[PDB]
Amino acid sequence: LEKEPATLIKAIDGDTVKLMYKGQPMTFRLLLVDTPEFNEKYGPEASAFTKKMVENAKKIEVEFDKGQRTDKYGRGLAYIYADGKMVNEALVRQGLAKVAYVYKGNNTHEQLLRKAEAQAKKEKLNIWS
Ligand SMILES: Cc1cn([C@H]2C[C@H](OP(=O)(O)O)[C@@H](COP(=O)(O)O)O2)c(=O)[nH]c1=O
Numbered sequence: 001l002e003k004e005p006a007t008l009i010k011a012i013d014g015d016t017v018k019l020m021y022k023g024q025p026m027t028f029r030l031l032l033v034d035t036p037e038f039n040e041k042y043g044p045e046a047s048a049f050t051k052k053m054v055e056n057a058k059k060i061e062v063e064f065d066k067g068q069r070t071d072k073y074g075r076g077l078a079y080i081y082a083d084g085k086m087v088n089e090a091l092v093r094q095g096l097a098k099v100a101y102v103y104k105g106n107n108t109h110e111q112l113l114r115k116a117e118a119q120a121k122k123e124k125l126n127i128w129s
């Protein structure tokens with residue numbers, strides 16, 4: 001997998017963000033995770049967490065996996081990095097997202113994220129508390 005440049009347009013919620021990618025505005029849905037909706041327990045904290053990570057970054061990158069790059073709603077499906085740190089993994093490590101939506105051929109970082117989830121759960125962080 002390869003990291004590509006993007007720039008932040010706007011934070012949206014815990015697991016979606018609007019980025020400019022190859023010059024075009026696109027909503028990105030983070031692969032392999034599920035954050036609570038804003039209206040649910042931990043939803044504001046997830047949204048806040050992702051917002052801070054992407055707004056504070058000097059460099060945002062997008063990494064597509066091997067499979068589908070857009071979902072049925074036209075959202076980009078990617079791993080998102082903020083100054084070299086993966087947002088997807090960070091949310092899971094903090095107990096602000098569950099590993100989820102693991103579909104064959106877009107699951108390169110699955111074991112990495114499951115390892116983060118285990119550690120979040122062992123710590124009883126946030127959704128695991
Ligand atoms: C993460 C992800 C979501 N989706 C679709 C499946 C779910 O469809 P349904 O909307 O039909 O439930 C939805 C969940 O996204 P949200 O968690 O953003 O709601 O997005 C994918 O098709 N591939 C993916 O990799």
Ligand SMILES: [Ca+2]
Pocket residue numbers: 015034035036037
């Ligand atoms: Ca969600």
